[PDB]
Symmetry: C3
Subunit: 336 residues, 3 copies
């Protein structure tokens, strides 16, 4: 009504949660607050607004994943268009639901500001990802305040997929991107020092190689990787050659910092919603899992949804897709 009476914001009520360990960074590993090494293992679900539109934003979704798919983590890809469409207040109210659901089940959330493009020039792959530096800062300001001292919310993934699309969106420049990530980290750490910022490299969060010489100059962070099957292109398709290429671009990072592969997965080239870079004959599955397990790398498969591809499920009865069936058994075995 009267703009001067608009309330100041409130923080999530931590008393509403059951006891749950905080996850933290220690050297190249995540650890829980009992000191035990921890690996994020789980899935993406679709944007909250997408799920709400078909009445699929429900605790039953989290229960299925925790109880039947072996997950300890769900990644929420918050699309800026949806953040605007629902509005911050309403969107945050739904994130609160996810927090309570995850907490009840003893699982963790990665909050992902889900854009694709080059934030320093504010140019993007598609309008669903459109944002500004101002809006991006404000999202992280609001999130960090609201979820202060909440162990369930473990990771703040600052910007899903940095890319300039062959420099059509701007001139990719590591120093500039590094500085902007450091700026976001500083805002976050000023508000909550317990959360783990997750930083991505260029080429759609595939190339971490700039961190060899110029890593982000902040402690307690982890690095993202999106090792989709068609990103590495060896002439001879075997474990050794893929492993070497992955090592060069992103895997080396796990020697020094924790790494979360926050997107990975495949569909057959003639399968549902097939597109570059997610097409594969299936051999990628065992290979990427072997690689990640060798390096202790964390992961959230894309995507546990029957509409968005590559799918893990064929329907809302959770009939597994090819990749779904594969990762389900991997996660169930890892949980044991």
């Amino acid at each position: 009504n009267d703009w001067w009476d608009i309330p100041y914001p409130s923080q999530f009520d931590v008393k509403s949660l059951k006891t749950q360990s905080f996850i933290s960074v220690k050297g190249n590993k995540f650890i829980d607050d009992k000191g035990k090494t921890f690996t994020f293992r789980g899935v993406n679900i679709a944007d909250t607004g997408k799920l709400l539109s078909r009445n699929q934003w429900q605790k039953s979704l989290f229960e299925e994943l925790a109880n039947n798919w072996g997950v300890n983590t769900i990644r929420l890809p918050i699309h800026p268009v949806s953040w605007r469409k629902l509005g911050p207040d309403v969107y945050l109210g739904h994130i609160d639901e996810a927090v309570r659901w995850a907490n009840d089940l003893g699982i963790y959330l990665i909050l992902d500001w889900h854009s694709i493009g080059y934030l320093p020039t504010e140019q993007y792959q598609h309008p669903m990802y459109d944002t500004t530096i101002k809006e991006t800062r404000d999202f992280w300001r609001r999130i960090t305040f609201r979820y202060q001292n909440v162990p369930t919310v473990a990771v703040y993934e600052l910007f899903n997929e940095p890319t300039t699309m062959g420099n059509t969106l701007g001139e990719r420049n590591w120093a500039e991107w590094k500085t902007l990530n450091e700026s976001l980290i500083d805002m976050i750490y000023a508000s909550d020092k317990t959360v783990i910022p997750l930083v991505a490299g260029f080429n759609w969060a595939y190339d971490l190689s700039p961190i060899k010489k110029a890593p982000i100059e902040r402690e307690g962070i982890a690095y993202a990787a999106h090792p989709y099957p068609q990103k590495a292109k060896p002439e001879v398709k075997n474990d050794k050659n893929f492993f070497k290429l992955w090592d060069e671009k992103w895997g080396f990072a796990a020697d020094t910092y924790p790494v979360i592969a926050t997107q990975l997965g495949w569909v057959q080239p003639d399968g549902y919603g097939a597109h570059i870079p997610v097409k594969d004959d299936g051999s990628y599955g065992p290979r990427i899992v072997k690689y990640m397990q060798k390096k202790g790398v964390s992961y959230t498969v894309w995507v546990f949804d029957p509409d968005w591809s590559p799918t893990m499920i064929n329907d809302w009865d959770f009939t597994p897709s090819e990749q779904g069936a594969f990762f389900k058994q991997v996660m169930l075995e890892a949980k044991k």
Copy 2:
């Protein structure tokens, strides 16, 4: 209708005003155009839009202040949300009213772009204060053009209360803020060299100390200070200790440049709309007045409104509040 026919803007008609002295900066003082030392002494009123909503935007308001409260100055806190809500054209049309009313009564206006936060990152304490560098420049561009050669409009207070809220809004950086103020000053001086820009420091316009080594590198400006009672926190509460702390952070500035305390005031801790940093037992009143009178510091008390706190009045019949009664007698005595 057709965007190509939208008129270019017009300037305030100076022929509509009665003769009134221009106020200017000379060394550490303000002077009128007869050469006599001048002190701004007055009050804030509420945002124009707030007053309009209850039909309280009236000349009778200015008349009460000039005739009965001893003021020579009114500060208008133009909130960006209200600037947008009324629209520039309509808001400026109401500022024109204030100009004619003030001019008729021989009093002056401070125009305050009333935001709280960190403009370089475009992050703010509350959405009522939300703005951008672009909108802020445009506000000053429009204001400076419209009120060219108008003596009644004396001071352009560029940004009410700079703060990063413990670096949650961004990393406070004096060089960056100094440069941005210099940029705004350059736009203003390109359009009207007679106006006085008023520059604020960090910690909600409390800390001017960076100007000891790095003052804004422009002539004819003054500095703002917001010495609310709870800003200085001496262990022993007496004149000497408060004076020393005020000296350290803002009072020293008055030795070299003119200073306007554009917000100050108090309410009892159990009084109406009490909040940090405006709570005091009342002893602050005599103390801040003694301090300002000693240093020749100008001031506008916050706020001459019965709804917005700390109030100077309890109702629209102008029943004085505690601080209202106090400052009313101070201003009346100073006017004599």
Copy 3:
């Protein structure tokens, strides 16, 4: 409907066009792809949205110009307010029409992002020109993608008229403007290397003199000039004195780079829609044409419209205005 289903954009179908030479830059000249020196000679028409509003956006308009006025070029001044009003999708669909019409007639288009002001501070002469760096980049991103490999679209005129209006809009700074143009060029060249970027100087695209020491550091570009009659102000009004002043500020550029005078023209001081800087007794016409022909300078007269001034026509039956009659004969003679 559902934002995740919003289509990715498509490119203009080059198979829809008849064969037409590409125009390119070679040293200080334009050449066609047969190697012959080429001069752009033509007119501006009004903004597409302006023409649509009165049902004047028609192929008949292009046919009149190509068949009866001797043009080989039409400049389209795309106003940001109109880009927003129609929306990118609809505006681009109308530009597609112009492409097909021009191509059919064997003539070329200059696409002009038609703003006036200082892009680095995002401050402008009038709201019809209002834009941001983000919107400007996005316009060029969309344009370059859509018209890839289209010979008909020859020139991308990045920003119509740079000016700070006496530094009221910001502090003019060549290094800053040069860098921003280079940034836009890099985005464009990443998407289509065949197009010709057209760069403007300060003082409403009049002053190219900064390029003597600090030219844009990219190949294949041309420079704009807007030599309106009142821009040069010799005390003695003859060819020699105007030529010298034009030489100093913009004409020298044609010695080293190709130049397009993308706005020029006049109306009598007591004529229709007369204003600075377009007022002249008519002697300017022969003088500017003589000057341009001497230097091999390309041009598009402002403006072939009966409402927008200075006009080339008095009505939609194409009754020529004074300047219209003059330039019509110049262009017809040049075409022969």
